[PDB]
Design a protein around this ligand. Structure first.
Ligand SMILES: [Mg+2]
Ligand SMILES: [Mg+2]
Ligand SMILES: [Mg+2]
Ligand SMILES: [Mg+2]
Ligand SMILES: [Mg+2]
Ligand SMILES: [Mg+2]
Ligand SMILES: [Mg+2]
Ligand SMILES: [Mg+2]
Ligand SMILES: [Mg+2]
Ligand SMILES: [Mg+2]
Ligand SMILES: [Mg+2]
Lengths: 58, 205, 291, 170, 159
RNA sequence: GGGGCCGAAACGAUCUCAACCUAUUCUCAAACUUUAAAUGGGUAAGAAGCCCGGCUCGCUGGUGUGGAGCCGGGCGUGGAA
RNA sequence: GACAGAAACCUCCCGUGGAGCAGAAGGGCAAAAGCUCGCUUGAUCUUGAUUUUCAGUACGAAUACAGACCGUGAAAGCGGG
RNA sequence: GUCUACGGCCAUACCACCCUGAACGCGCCCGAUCUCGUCUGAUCUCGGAAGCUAAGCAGGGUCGGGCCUGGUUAGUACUUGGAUGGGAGACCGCCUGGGAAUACCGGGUGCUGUAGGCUU
């Protein structure tokens, strides 16, 4: 009772029925996977933004 | 004990030569490709006749052997022993397979090497006959007789080249006179204007 | 006979080396491992001190790599040491130390950091390395580039390295290849190295040789005799050279000369000339065959 | 005028004894050529195993030395004393080097010792010309050019002009 | 079926070009990559470290993380019926800048200069790219000579 | 290297047959290739873009160097079909 | 070049890899990834991210980091099989 | 005109042979006490400066091989899409667009960056 093994016949139609959608894009991309040293220093800079506030407003 | 050629007369499978993968091939029945007075110079055998294929098919080494034998026999009977030169320009490199039965069936049906065939394109030359200028009808008759040993359709064409060369017969003698071509046996050598001129002066003196 | 190996197939499958490798100049393995900057450093220059010992002089440069080529920020040649007082012996350990010191001082003066980082003002030969002082700009850091020179104990590239370290460059090193390190027992004394820096081995050779035989002495030291430098002045002369270098490192370029435009080579022959040449040769051969 | 930088000189002389086995006889041969030259010889092993020759791989079966300069000329002229300054024309390489072989070493003037024995030597002298260090120096390696090479016939002429030897054909 | 091997079928893909084997040139290492740069991926067989998978060869992505010897980039890979924007870490020798963005940068800066200038002049300027238009009317001068005739040539069995 | 001949022999010589080398020549390769298409696979074609100024950093640093992040302001001819 | 030879050892010249890199094949490699020496245990401890098959699950394998403690080298560096 | 040190692109730079090199340089070259390393100061390391372009090296040359770039081969081979086209088939012609590679014939034979000399 041998049967059919592999096929990709109707697959293009199945895929394009709902369409091949480009991946969702947002203005801000997440900070996961970046260098830990780089991220540590950037978080320090963000943390200490506050202490230079008055100079910026002046 | 071979099958009829209508089985293996079509170029269906990919080219499949004898190599480290396909071993166990018996030898081809044809092993002599040049015959006649092959120890002849280029200047006395100016007439060349080709047997050109017309169909895209396969030819068996058995058919090649039979055709060369028939052509040689007729040429020897007609133009004498050594008034000609036969060159078969097809070498059987394709090896064909047989899935021999006797009850397994089609399970694992990949055949063993049975024989060799040569794959031939449209307009490709099968045999060439080189001889004097006054045996043209003998050449055409020999090729016409040899035509009957092959499947498909073949044409017979008297070439415009001098003998077994790639230069036209109307200007071969002119070039060899002005020292563009050097006879070196069955063929000829071509002398360009690009080497060191020591060869130039050696040739001109 | 013999199957010729260098034929048309050989030549058309041949694959040439790099041009510098073909000349034998550089080693691209160490080149890549030495000059390539770390990618997240983001265009920060990486500095080599290229040291080269020639048959007659010493070349020291400071360079960083760029796509179009290497940029040299400073350079010190040994053939300008007579301007500072070293008349002869321009390719020895003391000369290498002097040219390294000159390179370091000139670079610091050009960067404007010469008042800082005096270095080893009085030489002692032992291990020393400058540390960056807080508040002031940091110490200039470079890495040694010896090229194909075999880096064994007592090498003039390490002499120049010691000279520049005393000048004030922050180069990473260990006192294992300085002359004075003993291989068998693994210690380093500074007195032997200081003798080498002062050239006292040369002075001892001069004394030894003039004690035993004077013909070989005049043969082997002749410009020393012509500039009448005795084995006794060596130390004070080298000290004076060091002081002069440390007190005036800035370079004076030689003035550009007007050019008279004489061609000394042979210009490339043209197609018409060579074609007429081959025609002439053919005609002359035919005439000679005629006669 | 002949340029002084084209004077033939013997670059080096290589001496060896291939004894064919390892041990006491090898050590005695080492003492032989150490006495002959004045420097410690080096032992050469075997690259393969040849049963008909009785040698296995990595087995020390030869001894050799190289000598340069004054010692090279002295040993060379002693060997030429041994073979009366007579060389066959085939003994010369196409590069200009040449060599010969002696069956027994007491002909060299070294005193026989009963505990040492008898050994034959292969002498091979390679000539040169000022500027051959180019092909082997490290910093900028190059060739030596076609004019500056050494030819077989002029190696012969040099030999027969300074050692006034005789070159027999054959 | 096939094997699930990582380098299956890369025989001609990861090989070096003809007569370009040997030591890798140093400009490839010396080029610098900011984050956000558009980058072409092309595997090289000389370096086996940090080598991209065979499905990213010939693809183009965007740099997002730069590290000591490699860069992290985001590339679009198409699986059965969906597209995934996914991160790979590629060492520098398998990486190039793409000039497609450079063309746009040149064109945009040129439009900017041509917009800031020729604005006080008050003239109207075309800044978009219209496609290739149909050709305009023109005269063809047959000065003297008459157009020489062509005819098909007879058949000759040169085979 | 072989079949011989003159040669006690002689790369002294003769033919040779061979192997070898050098230029050519007939025909091929799914698991060969210097070259090398057509169709095809990515990316880009702006406002999340460009251009100024100023703050933070414990990362990087000869050098408020580099890089990153923040603030504030200016630019619409929405930049191929 | 004595014994020595078809094949032991020494010397010179040519030598783009026609060798070797444990094994199957493919790729890669020449002042090296091959050969010979010196020193060693990055085949060690730890948390995350990612790639390959993929359902974007697991295992296995692999890749870039980061934090220790080390090795090696003059050093840049290289090394967590 | 040119060289040296460090290079970028890596034969238009390679290879074989011949010719010429003013000045500086680069080298060959002279030695082994010191540092250092070898069976051997041959290599590597060190100390020099009597001699030398012989060689390396630079420039030039060869109806040079190779390499780079054109012509031809050729609108050929092959190929996207089409037809109730031909043909017993094998295969082939047309329409719509794209379009190669040998052989053969030409041309060329390193540009270039940083720093520093020579051409009084
Ligand atoms: Mg099913
Ligand atoms: Mg089939
Ligand atoms: Mg090194
Ligand atoms: Mg190594
Ligand atoms: Mg770590
Ligand atoms: Mg010497
Ligand atoms: Mg010269
Ligand atoms: Mg010369
Ligand atoms: Mg040519
Ligand atoms: Mg230049
Ligand atoms: Mg004058």
């Amino acid at each position: 009772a041998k049967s059919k093994n592999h096929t990709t016949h109707n697959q293009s139609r199945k895929w394009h029925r709902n369409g091949i959608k480009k991946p969702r894009s947002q203005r801000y991309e997440s900070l996961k996977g970046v260098d830990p040293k780089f991220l540590r220093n950037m978080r320090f800079a963000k943390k200490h933004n506050k202490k230079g506030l008055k100079k910026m407003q002046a | 004990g071979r099958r009829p050629a209508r089985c293996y007369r079509y170029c269906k499978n990919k080219p499949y030569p004898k190599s480290r993968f396909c071993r166990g091939v018996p030898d081809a029945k044809i092993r002599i490709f040049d015959l006649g007075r092959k120890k002849a110079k280029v200047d006395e055998f100016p007439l060349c006749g080709h047997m050109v294929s017309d169909e895209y098919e396969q030819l068996s080494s058995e058919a090649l052997e039979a055709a060369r034998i028939c052509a040689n026999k007729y040429m020897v009977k007609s133009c004498g022993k050594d008034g000609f030169h036969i060159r078969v320009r097809l070498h059987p490199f394709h090896v064909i397979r047989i899935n021999k039965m006797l009850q397994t069936g089609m399970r694992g049906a990949f055949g063993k090497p049975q024989g060799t065939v040569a794959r031939v394109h449209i307009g490709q030359v099968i045999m060439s006959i080189r001889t004097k200028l006054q045996n043209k009808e003998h050449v055409v008759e020999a090729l016409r007789r040899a035509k009957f040993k092959f499947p498909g359709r073949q044409k017979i064409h008297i070439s415009k080249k001098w003998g077994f060369t790639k230069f036209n017969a109307d200007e071969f003698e002119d070039m060899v006179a002005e020292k563009r071509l050097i006879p070196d046996g069955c063929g000829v050598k071509y002398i360009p204007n690009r080497g060191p001129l020591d060869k130039w002066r050696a040739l001109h003196s | 006979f013999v199957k010729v190996v260098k034929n048309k197939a050989y030549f058309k499958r041949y694959q040439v080396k790099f041009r510098r490798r073909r000349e034998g100049k550089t080693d691209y393995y160490a080149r890549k491992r030495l000059v390539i900057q770390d990618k997240n450093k983001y265009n920060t220059p990486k500095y080599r001190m290229i040291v080269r010992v020639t048959n007659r002089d010493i070349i020291c440069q400071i360079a960083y790599a760029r796509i179009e080529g290497d940029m040299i920020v400073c350079a010190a040649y040994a053939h300008e040491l007579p301007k500072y007082g070293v008349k002869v012996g321009l390719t020895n350990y003391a000369a290498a130390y002097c040219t390294g010191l000159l390179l370091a001082r000139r670079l610091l003066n050009r960067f404007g950091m010469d008042k800082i980082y005096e270095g080893q003002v009085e030489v002692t030969g032992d291990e020393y390395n400058v540390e960056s002082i807080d508040g002031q700009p940091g110490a200039f850091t470079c890495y040694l580039d010896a090229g194909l020179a075999r880096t064994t104990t007592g090498n003039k590239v390490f002499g120049a390295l010691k000279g520049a370290v005393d000048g004030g460059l922050s180069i990473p090193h260990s006192t294992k290849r300085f002359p004075g390190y003993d291989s068998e027992s693994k210690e380093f004394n500074a007195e032997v190295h200081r003798k080498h820096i002062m050239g006292q081995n040369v002075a001892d050779y001069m004394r030894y040789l003039m004690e035993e035989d004077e013909d070989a002495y005049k043969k082997q030291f002749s410009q020393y005799i012509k500039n009448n430098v005795t084995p006794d002045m060596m130390e004070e002369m080298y000290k004076k050279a060091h002081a002069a270098i440390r007190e005036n490192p800035v370079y004076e370029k030689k003035p550009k000369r007007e050019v008279k435009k004489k061609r000394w080579n042979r210009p490339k022959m043209s197609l018409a000339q060579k074609k007429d040449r081959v025609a002439q040769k053919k005609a002359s051969f035919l005439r000679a065959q005629e006669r | 005028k002949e340029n002084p930088m084209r004077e033939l000189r013997i670059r080096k002389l290589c001496l060896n004894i291939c004894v064919g086995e390892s041990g006491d006889r090898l050590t005695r041969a080492a003492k032989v050529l150490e006495q002959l030259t004045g420097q410690t010889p080096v032992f050469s092993k075997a690259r393969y195993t040849v049963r008909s020759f009785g040698i296995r791989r990595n087995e020390k079966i030869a001894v050799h030395c190289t000598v340069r300069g004054a010692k090279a000329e002295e040993i060379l002229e002693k060997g030429l004393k041994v073979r009366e300054y007579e060389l066959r024309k085939n003994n010369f390489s196409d590069t200009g080097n040449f060599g010969f072989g002696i069956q027994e070493h007491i002909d060299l003037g070294i005193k026989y010792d009963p505990s040492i024995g008898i050994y034959g030597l292969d002498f091979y002298v390679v000539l040169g010309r000022p500027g051959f260090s180019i092909a082997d120096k490290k910093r900028r390696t190059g060739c030596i050019g076609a004019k500056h090479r050494i030819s077989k016939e002029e190696a012969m002429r040099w030999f027969q002009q300074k050692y006034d030897g005789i070159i027999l054909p054959g | 079926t096939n094997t699930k091997g990582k380098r299956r079928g890369t025989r001609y893909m990861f090989s070096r070009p003809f007569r370009k084997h040997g030591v890798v040139p140093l400009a490839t290492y010396m080029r610098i990559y900011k984050k956000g740069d558009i980058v072409d991926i092309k595997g090289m067989g000389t370096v086996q470290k940090g080598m991209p998978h065979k499905c990213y060869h010939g693809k183009t992505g965007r740099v997002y993380n730069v590290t000591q010897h490699a860069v992290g980039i985001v590339v679009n890979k198409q699986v059965k019926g969906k597209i995934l924007a996914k991160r790979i870490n590629v060492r520098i020798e398998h990486i190039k800048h793409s000039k497609s963005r450079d063309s746009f940068l040149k064109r945009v800066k040129e439009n900017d200069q041509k917009k800031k200038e020729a604005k006080e002049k008050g003239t109207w300027v075309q800044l978009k790219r219209q496609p290739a238009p149909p050709r305009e009317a023109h005269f063809v001068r047959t000065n003297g000579k008459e157009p020489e005739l062509l005819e098909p040539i007879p058949y000759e069995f040169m085979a």
